[PDB]
Amino acid sequence: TARALREIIRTARETFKLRKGKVGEPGDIGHYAALLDFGNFYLAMTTDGVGTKVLVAEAVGKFDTIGIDMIAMNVNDLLCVGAEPLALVDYFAVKEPNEEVFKQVAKGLYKGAEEAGVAIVGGETAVMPDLINGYDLAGTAIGIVEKGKVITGERIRPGDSVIGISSSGIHSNGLTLARKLLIPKYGLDYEYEGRKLWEWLLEPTRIYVRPILELINSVEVHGLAHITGGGLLNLKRLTNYGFELEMPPIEGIFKLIHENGVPLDEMFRVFNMGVGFIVVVPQEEKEEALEILSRHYKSYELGNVTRELGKIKVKNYGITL
Template sequence: MRILGEDMGIPRSYREAGVDVDRVAEIHRRIAWIAERTFKTRRGRWGEVLIEVGHYAGLIDIGGGKALAMHVDGVGTKILVAQMMGRYDTIGVDCVAMCVNDIICIGAEPVALVDYLVVEEPREDLVVPIMEGLAKGAEEAGVAIVGGETAVMKDIVKGVRDGYGFDLAAMCIGVVDRDKIVYGDRIGIGDCIVGLASSGIHSNGLTLARRILLSRYRIDDYLDEIGCSIGEELLKPTRIYVKPILDV
């Protein structure tokens, strides 16, 4: 049996796709150590940090038995697929999903979000669809977009399509009762695992998936097996799991 990528020059790991995961992990450890040095600034005060860096979200005490959860995330190289396809109305949904889906992992309910959009050029046919996608994702997640930042950085931001380079990220906050925080330390043998169907690749692993698929196909190639083009499949928005999880 031939393994995909064997003797074909197709990457089979993040390392082969150009991402050194060990080096990234080491950098993350250094970042966490530096960040945690600042925890002492709120110790014994309102806003005291409740959880170390490395969980799905940060947590601070806000009194009344409540904690504020915070998470920031982006959509990574899925942006390049959007540029290749010239379609920008779904990438905002991904951005919201990447934030709120992590917030719920610690038991919090997402409530608000701010976005950061940086563009190569201020094009209406780029910015408006992105914002519409953000709004669609926010409505599905039950969060309000309460602000954000839009910056034009032509000298820094580039892409695979001239004039349409951009990056997108957001920061989300949520609220959780302190006695209902999910740390993951109570998972044990005999627990029931419930799986929820995804909507596709989502927004993680796109670097590897993109390089594997585009080494064999064009972005607009139609595949009968999936009923759409490669680009359309890769652009399927990340499923937002807030409502089904909060209903549990």
């Protein structure tokens, strides 16, 4: 996937010079979101989707939260350059124009939008049953960050504190593995620790806009990572320095999946494992960071950035990524 994307990424970098010296020239710093130079500020742009989570939503007929997933995926990405989310468009590629499905999808869209503080300003709907085996929902968000306030991860240094914010659950990655492993054996009505499997698999992705915006306006922040595809490997997008982490106990859906034969090494590269967002702050900001974050969601001091390079050691599980 990354080797196939080589040419797309390479030739897209050749187009950068098409806006050089002009408004819209891309500052080309960071990841998770593109940064376009508008002079006193950068416009941040990201694209993200719900993924095969929608196949579960269609199986049980519950569509009124996947709109929350798609807004959460995009605005959480925008936070990882330090940007404040502003606006979003959706892309809805569907097998058919089911009015009931669209009506519920719109409920999640409004809820997600209100919690994220963004206007939904437009979108496209393509009815494509030869192409789509369901209801693919994705979107593009834009945000704003003043220059000199961009948080890319360049300022991460060995010794910095690493703090995790709990996920709501599975969020929107690892659904393919979870579906293929659990549904044949248990079915979507199987009850596990008080909830049916479909409730575990459809729990809407958490939105981190309010705590992250309060954090960056209160303490010095060196890095911000939304835990999506690749799980903890996303930390490597921020920096080449290493990490020494203590991750929270494996509970809920992640425990069921592990109990069904997925080794922890793979789990931490796939699932968020209970931590949906990670921030890196200098050690003197640690106490205040934890306080601000803990007023919104359960948060953990996970560990430290290390002078050692390229390694993510999850100490309490004996794993190195």
